[PDB]
């Protein structure tokens, strides 16, 4: 059994928008080149997060059906999913993109930025548990779409119109698990577990927030 023509179409639009994500080498160089200290490190990491939110808005606008939602719900979806989507995207990069030595400097900055090991430890435990699953790009992109179109964020008006956009993504993802990794019949359930594990980062992030500065885009999206 295979994706229907309409699921192939849906998967194609998601994949094309996911692949056009890029972070500027201008930022990436700062990881390599700027001075090292708790304040500088937090500043650089805050710049990377600011860029991932911009990439995220561009990704999200091209999701099939998103630009038919009401504007207020569009904002509500972005605010509720930002942290989770950043971590999913960064997970993909640690496990597939970044070599051992530059992941090392990035992590050194993260661990030397004035953030609690309460945050840092589950974060790196998430990265390694996600890297174990050996997800395809298609799985990362659908999962990210499914995180974003989550109908039970606070403050959404029309929850059903969001439900109607998420459920076909869920169906595509389960089909994809049977075709891409049919040697593990429970692959879909493992992806689900990462959905719930991602949700815990909202908790740690809210505690990092209370302790404290940021960019205007981050101030809007997190209040």
């Amino acid at each position: 059994m295979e994706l229907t023509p309409d699921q192939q179409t849906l998967l194609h639009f998601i994949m094309d928008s996911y692949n056009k994500q890029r972070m500027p080498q201008e930022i990436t160089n700062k990881i390599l080149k700027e001075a090292f200290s708790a304040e500088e490190n937090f500043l650089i990491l805050t710049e990377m997060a600011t860029n991932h939110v911009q990439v995220l808005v561009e990704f999200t606008k091209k999701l099939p059906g998103f630009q038919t939602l009401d504007h207020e719900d569009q904002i509500a979806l972005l605010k509720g999913s930002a942290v989770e989507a950043m971590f999913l995207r960064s997970a993909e990069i640690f496990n597939k993109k970044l070599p051992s030595g530059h992941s090392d400097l990035l992590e050194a900055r993260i661990r030397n930025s004035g953030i609690s090991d309460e945050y840092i430890t589950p974060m790196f435990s998430f990265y390694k548990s996600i890297g174990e699953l050996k997800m395809t790009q298609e799985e990362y992109a659908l999962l990210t779409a499914i995180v974003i179109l989550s109908p039970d964020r606070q403050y959404i008006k029309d929850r059903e119109a969001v439900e109607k956009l998420q459920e076909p993504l869920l169906d595509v993802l389960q089909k994809l698990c049977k075709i891409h990794q049919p040697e593990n019949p429970q692959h879909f359930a493992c992806l689900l577990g990462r959905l719930t594990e991602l949700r815990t980062f909202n908790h740690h992030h809210a505690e990092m927030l209370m302790s404290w500065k940021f960019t205007p885009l981050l101030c809007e999206i997190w209040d």
């Binding site: 911009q54 808005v57 606008k61 504007h71 569009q74 904002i75 972005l78 205007p216 885009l217 809007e220 999206i221």
Partner: peptide, 10 residues
């Protein structure tokens, strides 16, 4: 959400 909505409408 001035900056967010600006990025949404581009």
């Amino acid at each position: 959400h001035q900056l967010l909505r600006y990025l949404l409408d581009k």
